Ligand binder design. Structure first.
Ligand SMILES: Nc1nc2[nH]c(CCCCc3csc(C(=O)N[C@@H](CCC(=O)O)C(=O)O)c3)cc2c(=O)[nH]1
Ligand SMILES: NCC(=O)N[C@@H]1O[C@H](COP(=O)([O-])[O-])[C@@H](O)[C@H]1O
Length: 200
């Protein structure tokens, strides 16, 4: 299966996917990395790995639908089967999500359905949980509400900050995102017609 990875930043999840998809038994190959932001470290990681990159600046488009259409053009250019959102921080439009239904995965740094949104660690810390974690899910139109593929729990330590908690949770992200991508690329897991996850 041919994979696009979309990023907005550092790209540690991208790097874990590059490493995993290059193992001999990988059912996935990364053929393009797309960033909505220029000069982010994730682009360096892609280029060093010899993977093509495109920057599609969302600021340059009239609305969400036109931005998504620009992304979609590149996905078609590279005959992409599966999209991974790896630190990509834009909400996607309904028609784009619908087109890629069952083919697009996101990593989120909480145990969904807790702490949906763009500041999950801040929420976890404010709430005072002692266990958080991360989630890989299929992307649905409602943000962070799509069908869950894998999750991993991560303890919150007393005195944690966003810096220390995000560091600990990223170690788990780098485990489950490669595992989830392999499950979907191998056809082991799919989004069922009834909308629920199907292990074949
Ligand atoms: N339809 C849909 N789009 C998705 N995009 C992502 C990817 C993960 C999204 C996380 C996220 C949660 S809220 C937010 C946000 O408000 N973004 C802003 C801009 C944020 C920024 O640029 O810094 C926006 O899009 O206007 C970003 C996941 C996901 C999803 O499940 N469904
Ligand atoms: N999807 C919402 C969200 O908060 N995503 C989070 O952004 C970070 C990106 O790090 P990276 O650029 O090093 O992969 C990751 O922790 C990811 O779970």
């Amino acid at each position: 299966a041919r994979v696009a990875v979309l990023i907005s930043g550092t790209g540690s999840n991208l790097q874990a996917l590059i490493d995993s998809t290059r193992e001999p038994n990988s059912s996935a190959q990364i053929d393009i990395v797309i960033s909505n932001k220029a000069a982010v470290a994730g682009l360096d990681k892609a280029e060093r790995a010899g993977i093509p990159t495109r920057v599609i600046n969302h600021k340059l488009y009239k609305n969400r639908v036109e931005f998504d259409s620009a992304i979609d053009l590149v996905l078609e250019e590279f005959s992409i089967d599966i999209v991974c959102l790896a630190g990509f921080m834009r909400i996607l439009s309904g028609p784009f999500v619908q087109k890629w239904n069952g083919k697009m995965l996101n990593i989120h740094p909480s145990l969904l359905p807790s702490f949906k949104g763009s500041n999950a660690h801040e929420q976890a810390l404010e709430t005072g949980v002692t266990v958080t974690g991360c989630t890989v899910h299929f992307v649905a139109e409602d943000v962070d509400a799509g069908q869950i593929i894998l999750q991993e729990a991560v303890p919150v330590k007393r005195g944690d900050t966003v810096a220390t908690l995000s560091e600990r949770v990223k170690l788990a992200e780098h485990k489950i995102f490669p595992a989830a991508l392999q499950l979907v690329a191998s056809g082991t897991v799919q989004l069922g017609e009834n909308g629920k996850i199907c292990w074949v």
